[PDB]
């Protein structure tokens, strides 16, 4: 049996090259080895003030941003997480199985912190409901993710002894290239930078695209050498990275390629690269974008699939709590 | 049109004769005056630990017993909270306007949906365009939040909820300074004759010699109790009473408020195993209940949703 996986995806709109070649390029080629959901999680994006109309637009933004990098809707789940209505049903039933101090001591609570609210503090309950729902075995996690998903299984655990095997206990599972920060080469590149420079979209429009690469940070070594070296060449290694990750060459290939060249030609083949690379993201995107009928079948299906996998497990739930079973 | 009425019966199924003469007897009377809703709340039970076998009998028990006291299923909406996804949904979205310090500064307030009921509360309320509320003086603070968080909501993006309003003397029959909620100081509506004569029997009265069956909340409590029970069921005023019970002894009285008591709980008990019985009419009574409840809550949902920039589900 498949292996499930499940990934949350904030309505923001935006990805980086970093988030596509690191992480999303490689997990389109593994629809068909994994049950991959992907959940565009707009209930968690209300957790801070949102401009409604952007939230609208930018969930769409996504969906068709995920669509062009290649997820297939047909292979994967993909859907809108409040067309689901059994996120926020275990969600609530979750959170009288979670103590209150497990959720007061988060860090993104604290971090996040007499202006607060309480969808702030209690996000955490719906993105285990969110894993749980769906028998889920894996969960890409960052760094900073990584305390919700101990929570997630501590809570799984916790109901599991309760009631019996209801739930998967999920496990972190994080497979691809390397790509950090165009100005500051030894932080990865990140979507939430201040510093827009550092970042490259994938729907950055391309003359802004070869601009950041040309403003991207080398070394002073005299004569310019081209070669890999992340401690001493962190700036250097990076574009070499970023091209080995786009054209499928080696490092040592590039290296040999780039023998008595100057940084300049690296970063002349890196933008054209990368601008190659997005506009065919670009030509995809566009044409999803900009059929909202499509979106709107894309979004039905997936919600459909979603919440007749979910259904199971809340139907399980709520048998084992004791709640009389909905005729 | 009608004023719509949300009310709360949590799944506990003992109700006494206070409760119902109370509150439940003259909401059942009202029930074309109001659109009245009444919601069995099987998630708010679960924020303390319960038995599941016991959840889900006293859910039953209490739709059997609110249909046998003459809640129509027609004329009001009568359903099991969980049937109705629409609750959780608008409690998860209300949580993102509700501060922190509102849940944390609650009188009666561990997990964590202890801490957040009043949020899944106020759901409950504003989901139906409420337009009142009847709420014990231990809730008076939720209905409050849920009227906070109602006006904030509709002042960040349009009037999309109504903001509502809140909406018998029967005591405990060992000591009456206390109202009706030791079961012996209470008489519940599924409680045979046999059991009801002989709390009635037992309950406190005065010491008066000759003793007389007199009105008097200062010196004779106990029998002006049972004056107030008797009074109640039979409809009679307590100076007809008085009139009626001038020359007989609390003996009398106490007989007399036991039969009128059976007769009554009689007429709600035979309907009651009648109804409890019924697995196949319950079963379509909350089905009815909860496809009435959604299509009214949906209503206020998408508009919530709409307002705060999701996607419509296609
Ligand atoms: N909280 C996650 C989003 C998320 C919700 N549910 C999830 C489940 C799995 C992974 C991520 C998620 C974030 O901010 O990125
Ligand atoms: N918590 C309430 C039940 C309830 C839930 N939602 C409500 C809305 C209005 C009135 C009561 C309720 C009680 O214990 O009685
Ligand atoms: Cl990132
Ligand atoms: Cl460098
Ligand atoms: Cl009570």
Redesign the interface.
């Known amino acids: 049996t498949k292996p499930i996986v499940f990934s949350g995806a904030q309505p923001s709109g935006e990805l980086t090259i970093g988030n596509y070649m690191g992480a999303l390029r490689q997990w389109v080629n593994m629809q068909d080895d994994y049950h991959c959901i992907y959940c565009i999680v ?2 968690h994006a ?2 801070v003030r ?7 637009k930018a ?2 933004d996504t969906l068709a941003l995920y669509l062009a990098c290649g997820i297939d809707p047909q292979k994967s789940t993909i859907f ?1 997480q ?2 689901v ?2 996120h ?2 275990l ?3 979750l ?6 101090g ?2 007061s001591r988060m860090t993104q609570f604290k971090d996040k912190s ?9 996000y955490p ?2 993105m285990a409901a969110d894993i749980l729902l769906y028998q889920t075995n894996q969960v890409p996690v960052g760094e900073d993710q990584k305390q919700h998903l101990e929570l997630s299984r501590d809570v799984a655990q916790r109901f599991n002894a309760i ?1 019996g095997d209801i739930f998967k206990v999920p496990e972190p599972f994080i497979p691809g290239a390397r790509v950090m920060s165009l100005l500051e080469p030894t932080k990865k590149m990140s979507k939430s930078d201040d510093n827009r420079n550092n970042v490259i979209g994938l729907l950055e429009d391309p003359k802004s695209v070869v601009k950041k690469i040309k403003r991207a940070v080398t070394d002073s070594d005299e004569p310019p050498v081209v070669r890999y070296d992340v401690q001493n060449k962190a700036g250097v290694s990076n574009l070499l990275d970023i091209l080995s990750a786009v054209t499928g060459q080696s490092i040592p290939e590039l290296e040999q390629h780039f023998e008595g060249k100057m940084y300049g030609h690296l970063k002349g083949e890196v933008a054209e690269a990368v601008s190659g690379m997005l506009t065919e993201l670009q030509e995809r995107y566009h044409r999803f974008r900009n059929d909202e009928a499509f979106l ?2 894309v ?2 299906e997936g ?1 459909e699939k979603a919440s007749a996998h979910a259904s199971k497990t809340l139907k399980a739930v ?1 048998e ?5 079973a ?2």
């Open positions: 707009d209930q209300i957790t949102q401009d409604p109309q952007n939230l609208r969930t769409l809108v409040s067309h209505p059994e926020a049903q969600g609530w039933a959170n009288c199985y979670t103590y209150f497990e959720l007499e202006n607060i609210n309480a969808g702030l503090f209690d309950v719906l009631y709107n079948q979004m039905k919600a709520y084992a709590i004791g709640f009389v909905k005729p």
